[PDB]
Amino acid sequence: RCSSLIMLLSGHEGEVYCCKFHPNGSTLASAGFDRLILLWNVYGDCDNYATLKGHSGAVMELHYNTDGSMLFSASTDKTVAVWDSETGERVKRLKGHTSFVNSCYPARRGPQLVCTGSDDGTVKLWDIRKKAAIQTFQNTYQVLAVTFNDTSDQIISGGIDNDIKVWDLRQNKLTYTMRGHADSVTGLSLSSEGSYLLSNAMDNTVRVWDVRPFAPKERCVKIFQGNVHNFEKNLLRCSWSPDGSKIAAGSADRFVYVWDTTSRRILYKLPGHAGSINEVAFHPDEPIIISASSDKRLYMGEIQ
């Protein structure tokens, strides 16, 4: 067993584009095509204790700060909503993007900054007390996944420009371009220790880069196969294990993929889903995996 809780989560009315664990590990957030975030309990009978309405379009990216009280939600319409998790009312809207917002990310260490990316190309940063766009990094093409580093002083935007592009918050320029992908980069996730960063793209390959000031001049250290991207062209997301040992990239062939970081082999190829798997997440404390896919269902499960 090695946990406290394969039990299924049904109740999503359409696709689930993003699933995230609360960092305390007792509650759960999942959202997608429903314009409707569902808050589950991780243990117990896995009920749906709270619901978040306030998106006029589908929810592209759910995200939790390490505080875990406020939930960040990049939606399809033009907006990124900021919610609270206990009583569940949207404390803020963030309305500066002119197209479909594909991504958001919490700044967890310092001030609460929400770096977002959208289909216009603008990568916009969002302090919640400003109610405005702080800095807009103008990428010429669409960005599908954005994330901070551990320092929250750089933004790491992956998009359809075949390159992962990092922007410095003080230099306000693109510093270097992680080239080596052959299609649109859909999912970026960064470790709890913050040195390494996962990359999913429609070249049906997964990369690990090392976003760190110590530069090895070719940051593509680890290349993973097995993944596939299909005609549906979703935003196939990613996650890291909290011990940093396992990566998980969502795939288009209904199989929950979990690799080993060191071994570079597929540890887990899990069945059960029926559609393209958008986001697959990791529990903070115990080795539990939820997986979100287009089959309107979630699969919790003890990996170890």
Binding site: S56, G57, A58, T76, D77, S99, F100, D119, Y141, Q142, I160, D161, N162, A182, S184, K233
Partner: peptide, 25 residues
């Protein structure tokens, strides 16, 4: 990649998300 195969690649994706996440779908 190229430039025209990164502008047509954006045109095919703008005309993908503009209709897939259209507010009538």
């Amino acid at each position: 990649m190229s430039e025209e195969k990164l502008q047509e690649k954006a045109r095919k994706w703008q005309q993908l998300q503009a209709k897939r996440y259209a507010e009538k779908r």
